[PDB]
């Protein structure tokens, strides 16, 4: 190899992580909020510089390598839970929150951030503003939201949509107060999910691109796909939605340039 070449999409706007973490209001756990992030540069250093009381645990990728990865989309799910239920926000976990409110898939490949919010979400006289679902007919599928309240008939006698014995209201309140322990105090939780598809990789990250060099052996990097070889002006047929081509040996052999929308063959040098 002779040269190192980096090719990333030309996007300038930065991602709005300050609007997710520093939002005045957070949602409940049975009606958790979801935001879509795309077409922006994602610098994750602002999430490391936070004080060492932000619990940060990420699955399927290391936190250090996040700045050299492109993504199709990012999803941010925000809510507030109790102190000791942060254990349940993890793949392959069960409990009252996980079964009935928020479920994570086993192949999650995403990060979870939690922090104590007792100074904001608690009130001296009682803060019943945050709810959670306690009764459900069956466990819910990953990333499914149930914003609906109807009576739960545990027994056998039906009831006229009114509570009573063996007819329960599904939702309950948290009732946070400042005079509790550490496990009974509100916690603000943000879950980041990285959606990676066969797409033009909108959410790139901080990286400057270089000029394209052909007919020479170089180190190349297209949207995080990095390797060593020679780049030839291909004459293959890609559909407008297709981004790269795979060979019989289950490894990429052709790729589209993210700045000028042309096709290139990759060959060993």
């Amino acid at each position, epitope marked *: 190899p002779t040269e190192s070449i980096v090719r990333f999409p030309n996007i300038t*706007n930065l991602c*709005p992580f300050d*609007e997710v973490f*520093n*939002a*005045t209001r957070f949602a409940s756990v049975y009606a958790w909020n979801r*935001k879509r992030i795309s077409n922006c540069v994602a610098d994750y250093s602002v999430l490391y510089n936070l004080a060492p009381f932000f619990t940060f645990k990420c699955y399927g990728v290391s936190p250090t390598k996040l700045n050299d990865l492109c993504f199709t989309n990012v999803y941010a799910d925000s809510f507030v839970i109790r102190g000791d239920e942060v254990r349940q926000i993890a793949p392959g976990q069960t409990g009252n929150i996980a079964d009935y409110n928020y479920k994570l898939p086993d192949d999650f490949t995403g990060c979870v951030i939690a922090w104590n919010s007792n100074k904001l979400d608690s009130k001296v006289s009682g803060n019943y503003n945050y709810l959670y679902r306690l009764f459900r007919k069956s466990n819910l599928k990953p990333f499914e939201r149930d914003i609906s309240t109807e009576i739960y008939q545990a027994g056998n006698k039906p009831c006229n949509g009114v509570a009573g014995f063996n007819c329960y209201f599904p939702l309950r309140s948290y009732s946070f107060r400042p005079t509790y322990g550490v496990g009974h105090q509100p916690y603000r939780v943000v879950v980041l999910s990285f959606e990676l598809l066969h797409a033009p990789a909108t959410v790139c990250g901080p990286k400057k691109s270089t000029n394209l060099v052909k007919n020479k052996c170089v180190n190349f990097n297209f949207n995080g796909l990095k390797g060593t070889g020679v780049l030839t002006e291909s004459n293959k047929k890609f559909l407008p939605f297709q981004q790269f081509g795979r060979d019989i040996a289950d490894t990429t052999d052709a790729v589209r340039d993210p700045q000028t929308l042309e096709i290139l063959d990759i060959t060993p040098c």
Partner: antibody
Amino acid sequence: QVQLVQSGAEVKKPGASVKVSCKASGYPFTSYGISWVRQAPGQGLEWMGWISTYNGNTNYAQKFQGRVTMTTDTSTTTGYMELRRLRSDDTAVYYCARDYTRGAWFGESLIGGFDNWGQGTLVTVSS
Amino acid sequence: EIVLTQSPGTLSLSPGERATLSCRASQTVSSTSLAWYQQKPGQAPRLLIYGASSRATGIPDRFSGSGSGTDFTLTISRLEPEDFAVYYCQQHDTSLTFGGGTKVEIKR
């Protein structure tokens, strides 16, 4: 350092219209909104409105609901404000501020305030 | 909408005492949605406190904020010659409105 520069003073007449400009420098333009406030000589502050620099969404005060309109230009990173049908009560000083009270992308409330102010533009309305 | 009242209208102190300013809210205002500003004669305002407790960037430690619910307080532990100005409280819990203002001068 974050910087905001406003235009010069105006000697507008009643029944006219006025444009006030505010050029930003030293930060990513589209990550923050822009707020407009004013102070009449001898009185206190008075919020006029907010505009998002990402999608152009605005939010005005009901006192200026039908009279004011704000715009942005991302190329030069400059905000503009029209006020129409100037009365004798519109003689004041107008301040452009960088906003941290409402999000630029999603439009929700944040924890902060007007954390960077301009020099102020004096508008005098008299026949 | 929410109306904020600043009390009192004028504080007459000496360069070195302790000052306490009070902002009173009509309705209930969340503590995450209140801020304080200082304005010197002939200058533009500037942010001092946000979130009713947090301190803005580059603000000397002698400024502190506190309060909740319907009553908020800004305290200056020791008064310097440069701390004589006008102070404003702002809420953005329901719309956005400002306070009346409170001037702090020298008592001699």
